[PDB]
């Protein structure tokens, strides 16, 4: 059931990275977007955000979201999560790091809830193009028409087709830890943490410790506060500094792997044939730019392939050998002459 995914549900931690276009400039958003994969057909997009969707801190859920504000995972009800493109999208399902959504064509993808007192959105420059499966360069999945073996991402989550790495988090920096006691700087740890003390003054440079204080140095701006939180693990993101140790294992299954489904494809209007002596007058009234392919059935193929968008009349020389033409997604047909 839902709770049979503890590996990603329990062990993962929402990490924060450097969104390129966080609102006005590049801030450090908790929803730093990574690995946009718009490689499907019908226009479904898989986005690997830096926030962890679905699971409340308290084991598991789905109506909740876990994002990291500060040193703590301030989880909330997911409520107004946007997934934007040239036009706003409509998300399908969300699972931990990944969120599957269907978008209209565009050149930018932006993600963001709006926690209410603050927005915390993020975008990234990445073109998204949607080629419908078939011979007709349509734009949106139509109500009716024939169906073809398309490829897209399943809405299902309980799959293990592919895996991704997840190791110990790196030494996250946090300046707010370097408080002072009016005589020397005081370090602090919230709970179970083991911070690292480093300062410019000639002193103990290593400073690995629980709650403790500096030896001699006094200038906060002349120190470093690195934080260790190895109790949880994070995704191997390219915007986060590597931990100095071992690549901790644990394969997080990819929630939405591509599958070979069936999409509804458009159906071009039927051509109006008009026979002529050893000549096939073909009246065409395309609705959207559709491929037209024809080939002679004789010894010489004599291929002809050309996209047609504006309604036009084309003619072909149908010899006694015979001729074949495939208009749009219609099944191929054949013809004689006298």
């Amino acid at each position, epitope marked *: 059931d839902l709770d049979t995914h503890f590996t990603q549900y329990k062990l993962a931690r929402p990490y924060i990275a450097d969104c390129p276009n966080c609102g006005h400039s590049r801030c450090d958003s908790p929803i730093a977007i990574e690995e946009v994969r718009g490689d499907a057909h019908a226009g479904v997009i898989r986005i690997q955000t830096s926030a962890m969707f679905g699971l409340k801190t308290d084991g598991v859920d789905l109506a909740y979201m876990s994002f990291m504000n500060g040193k703590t995972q301030k989880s909330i009800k997911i409520d107004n999560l946007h997934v934007r493109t040239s036009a706003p999208c409509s998300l399908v399902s969300h699972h931990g790091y990944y969120i599957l959504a269907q978008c209209p064509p565009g050149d930018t993808v932006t993600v963001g809830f709006h926690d209410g007192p603050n927005r915390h959105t993020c975008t990234v420059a990445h073109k998204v193009e949607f080629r419908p499966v078939g011979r007709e360069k349509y734009r949106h999945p139509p109500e009716h028409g024939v169906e073809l073996p398309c490829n897209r991402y399943t809405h299902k989550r309980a799959d293990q087709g592919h895996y991704v790495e997840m190791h110990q988090p790196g030494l996250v920096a946090d300046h707010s830890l370097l408080s002072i006691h009016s005589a020397k700087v005081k370090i602090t740890v919230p709970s179970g943490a083991q911070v690292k003390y480093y300062c410019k003054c000639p002193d103990v440079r290593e400073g690995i410790t629980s709650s403790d*204080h500096t*030896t001699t140095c006094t200038d906060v701006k002349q120190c470093r506060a690195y934080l260790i939180d*190895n109790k949880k693990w994070v995704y191997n993101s390219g915007r986060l500094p590597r931990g*100095e140790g071992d690549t901790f294992k644990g394969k997080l299954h990819v929630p939405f792997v591509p599958v070979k489904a069936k999409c509804i494809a458009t159906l071009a209007p039927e051509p109006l044939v008009e026979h002529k002596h050893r000549t096939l007058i073909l009246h065409l009234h395309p609705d959207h730019p559709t491929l037209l392919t024809t080939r002679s059935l004789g010894s010489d193929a004599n291929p002809t392939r050309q996209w047609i968008e504006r309604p036009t009349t084309v003619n072909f020389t149908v010899t006694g050998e015979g001729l074949e033409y495939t208009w749009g997604n219609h099944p191929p047909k054949r013809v004689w002459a006298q």
Partner: antibody
Amino acid sequence: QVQLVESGGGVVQPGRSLRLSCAASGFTFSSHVMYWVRQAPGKGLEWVAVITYDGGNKYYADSVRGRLTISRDNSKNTLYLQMNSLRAEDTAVYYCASPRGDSGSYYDIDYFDYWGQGTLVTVSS
Amino acid sequence: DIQMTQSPSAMSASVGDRVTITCRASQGISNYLAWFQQKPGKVPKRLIYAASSLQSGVPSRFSGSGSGTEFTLTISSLQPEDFATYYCLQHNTSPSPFGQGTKVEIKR
């Protein structure tokens, strides 16, 4: 059974160098933190140094910093202490030790459970 | 650096006595501290860790208390095998200094 076996102790002149070794067996040596502790004749214990499972971090008491170098060879299950510029104050039994046999990258809270019998270093002319 | 101060440096006690050894850190070490017994000519043996976790296989007569800067080893009823030198160790930071050791001798 977990064993640690120190070797390379002996008599050395002041200002000379000596290399201690500690062979390990009965546990996954390459996964655990290793420590040197010394005890001068008739004195209390003194913490000398520590090295991580990978050797990537190394720490030293201020009394030995710049003169002693801790190292390891995980392929040989062997810990080393290179001692340079030895002084009469470095005369001690040196003990090889580890925490309980459970692993970590740059973390430990089981300090000093398994130890060797120690090797005597005498620094004298 | 951190320094560990043990009090007393030596004490005389009888079999059956309650022995209390105090260790003070020069800076806070939370509860990342351990206690070690050493008999003459032997290797040290750990008795307590985390300032109160009794080591597996060590007698229930040993007990530990304190947090932050002040810590203790309490032997509830001193046995003939307990006459030894006792060390505290802080393990919160590296370097990890031992205390000077407290020698428990037989009172006569």
